[model samples]
Target: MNIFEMLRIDEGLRLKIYKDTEGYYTIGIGHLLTKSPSLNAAKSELDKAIGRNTNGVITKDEAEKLFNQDVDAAVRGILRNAKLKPVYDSLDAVRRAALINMVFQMGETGVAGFTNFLRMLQQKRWDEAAVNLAKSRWYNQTPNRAKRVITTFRTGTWDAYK
Candidate 1:
């Protein structure tokens, strides 16, 4: 649960359905239940994942299941990213874990949009990358969480989290 332990706290799981910052129906550790301000999908995979029904009940165990599935996807997404392949491979485990957490919150494309930050990462500019992160809307949205996550890239330790 190395990654899960950190992310579980980072993302702050909520079992009941809630609206995300962008107004998407979300639940279970940032799972996008559905998001269609003017349109709607026939079905969302989250429903299929838990076999949702009108009378359905969810538990922490089930939520963790979805979290693990999403985490696995995040891991694969980062590793498969062409732009990040070399930089990702060069990072240590703790730092790599930070990236996985990053991809989990903001898809590969979202993280990829950090062009400057990516360059800094490739150059091993941890301090620059950390400051660069603060310049993004994400840092403003969750400064407390971002602070520790950003520090992980610099120090390569979980001390900030502690």
Candidate 2:
């Protein structure tokens, strides 16, 4: 899959996706700015929280590099945490990548909480999937970002199908 194409995100969007580090390698989530003690460092803290395993240890730089090498695999792990394995595994490559991008931005738990959407996926109901996606909290939460992603998953056509 083409990472840039599947994500339908340009450099401007990437800048938005990555948190501002200010001379550091750190990144943060903008939504949590006021709630967190400080800008939540993305690559470090998120890598730790999301990447932690049964061993209760987060992967370090080298391990992170290895893990991220297979973006698809990393995306799968993220979906598994979202309790979306059944639907996630059933999707085609393009759809899967789009879902992963959404999960990365919204957090797996956040997407998992959409009961209506999950129900549609559970039944392989494409029409419902489209509708469920349109009505999502993600749609409401971040209209622009959600618009691009929802359109991708809903139609499986975007960015010239690269």
Candidate 3:
């Protein structure tokens, strides 16, 4: 399969903001909201990545490019953050992907703010981590997406919301 198909399966194709796995406003795969300092950086990165303003409809091909560029930056941000890198690299692939998704949705600094949740993850207490995830404002804002992440955390499986 191609990169686009893999991303489509991983992130779920969307043309509009769909409130990603962390309840942050997101569109075109996993492009997080363009707010906050770190996220403002993300928007700037996206503008460079796409080479244009994205205020209108985009084809699947365009969406794929956006996703690729955005995910690249998000991963780099996660790797660059010394605080998050250890915790992020310690998890298995499924949990690691979930954490990356959180970073994508909330930005590196935003994910860093989740002290309790990070503690739970550090201890490998998946169930408690899921509960902690549900208790956050992120969960309240997007319960369905949060539910999927919680389940993924608990089950160690990457199950997308339908």
Candidate 4:
């Protein structure tokens, strides 16, 4: 498969500001903060795009390209994560996507730390797994988003938050 296709499988497509694993502000696919001027430039552009405040506007096409690059890098990390490799390989597309979503929200290391949650998933106990996911700082911080993910884990379906 093409690199973009493979990476996009897990990262999904997004075009807005969000938090990454390290709790750093990010935008596009999974762009994390580095000590780079470009990061601020992107943020300024994003703010303009959403009418938050700025002179430079980021078009949808620009956002998409940024997403592609970000996901490309982010997927490499996920692929290299020993803890996630086996579990990631075993799940169906939707479940795999759910795992990736969790990874993006909390980072691979954070997701790996959820011993009981991962165990429940590995054991194929959907209800318990969903319950386990709900009982987390992530869940507490974003209940609606967490609920959508919990639903995906419970039903093995792709339920995007609207």
Among these predictions, the greatest TM-score belongs to 1
lDDT of 4 by residue, 1-162 (tens): 333443354345455555555455555555453424465755765665455663333456666766655555445657898877767776677777677667765677898888898788888899999998898998887777678778877987654432
| Worst lDDT 10-window in candidate 2 | 26-35
Model 1 lDDT-worst window of ten: 37-46
Q: Give the alpha-carbon lDDT of every model.
A: 0.80, 0.53, 0.71, 0.65
Per-residue error (Å), model 3, residue 128 = 1.2
Q: On a 0 to 1 TM-score scale, where does candidate 4 land against the true structure?
A: 0.67
The stretch of ten residues in a row with the least summed lDDT in candidate 4 is 1-10
> Comparing candidate 2 with candidate 3, which one achieves the higher lDDT?
3
Ranked by lDDT, top first: 1, 3, 4, 2
Off by over 4 Å in 1: 37-45, 54-57
Better of 1 and 3 by TM-score: 1
Of 3 and 4, the candidate ranking higher by TM-score: 3
lDDT of 3 by residue, 1-162 (tens): 332343455567777445555445556786655544354455554566566775434567877777878778878998999889889888887777777777766779999988898888988998998888887898897677667767877878654533
Per-residue C-alpha lDDT of model 1 across residues 54-133, encoded as one tens digit per residue: 12235788778888899999988888899877778988889988888889888899998899998898888899999999
1 or 2, greater by TM-score = 1
Candidate 4 residues lying further than 4 Å off, grouped into runs, are 1-25, 29-57, 159-162
Clashing pairs in 1: none
**In model 1, how large is the Cα lDDT of residue 31?**
76
